[PDB]
UniProtKB/Swiss-Prot annotation:
Catalytic residues identified in the record: 58
Cell compartment(s), UniProt: Nucleus
Subunit structure and binding partners: Homodimer. Interacts with APOBEC3G. Does not interact with APOBEC1.
Residue window of the full protein shown: 190 to 378 of 382
Function, as annotated: DNA deaminase (cytidine deaminase) which acts as an inhibitor of retrovirus replication and retrotransposon mobility via deaminase-dependent and -independent mechanisms. After the penetration of retroviral nucleocapsids into target cells of infection and the initiation of reverse transcription, it can induce the conversion of cytosine to uracil in the minus-sense single-strand viral DNA, leading to G-to-A hypermutations in the subsequent plus-strand viral DNA.
Species name: Homo sapiens (Human)
UniProt comment concerning the protein's domains: The CMP/dCMP deaminase domain 1 mediates RNA binding, RNA-dependent oligomerization and virion incorporation whereas the CMP/dCMP deaminase domain 2 confers deoxycytidine deaminase activity and substrate sequence specificity.
Annotated residues for binding of Zn(2+): 56, 87, 92
Protein's name according to its UniProt entry: DNA dC->dU-editing enzyme APOBEC-3B
Assigned protein family: Belongs to the cytidine and deoxycytidylate deaminase family.
Length: 181
């Protein structure tokens, strides 16, 4: 597993609104299989994706699902730690919705560092994901540190939080839950 540079992680998962980073998304993913109330963690199916040549990371994740060789007779939970919530206007929310409709064996958990409200239809993207069965939430300190510990070439350095991490997370979470109520 190639691990992400720490600078790339910190530049992209920051949730401070005064840090500009609209040009790029990073999407860390893991997959587990749900059997009789216990998960089979599948470490060979973890990684991260960014946007490439105009194709958003969310669509690039959909692009690689067949290579994960999921058994449709099984149930899987996919988790996304994504630096921006998925857009509507460039097709991500719609494609994820259609994917989850066609792939009823897949459950999707989305934890976003920030809300992508550069998209005029960002609220509709979030509601569309919720309506398609995705559980959508804002990243807290716990998830940022997990991501640092799991996806980052950190050489045993501990996660060090940026100023305001918890405050911004809680404000974002309030906005999100208001949108999804
Ligand atoms: Na595709
Ligand atoms: Zn998108």
């Amino acid at each position: 597993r190639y691990l992400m540079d720490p600078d790339t992680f910190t530049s992209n998962f920051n949730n401070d609104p005064l840090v500009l980073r609209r040009r790029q998304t990073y999407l860390c993913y893991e997959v587990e299989r749900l059997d009789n109330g216990t998960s089979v963690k599948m470490d060979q199916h973890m990684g991260f994706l960014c946007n490439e040549s105009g194709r958003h990371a969310e669509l690039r994740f959909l692009d690689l699902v067949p290579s994960l060789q999921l058994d449709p007779a099984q149930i899987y939970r996919v988790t996304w730690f994504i630096s921006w919530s998925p857009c509507f206007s460039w097709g991500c929310a719609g494609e994820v919705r259609a994917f989850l409709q066609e792939n009823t064996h897949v459950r999707l958990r989305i934890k976003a560092a920030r809300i992508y409200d550069y998209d005029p239809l960002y609220k509709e993207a979030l509601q569309m994901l919720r309506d398609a069965g995705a559980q959508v939430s804002i990243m807290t300190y716990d998830e940022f540190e997990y991501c640092w510990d799991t996806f980052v070439y950190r050489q045993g350095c501990p996660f060090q939080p940026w100023d305001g991490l918890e405050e911004h997370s809680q404000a974002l979470s309030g906005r999100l839950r208001a949108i999804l109520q």
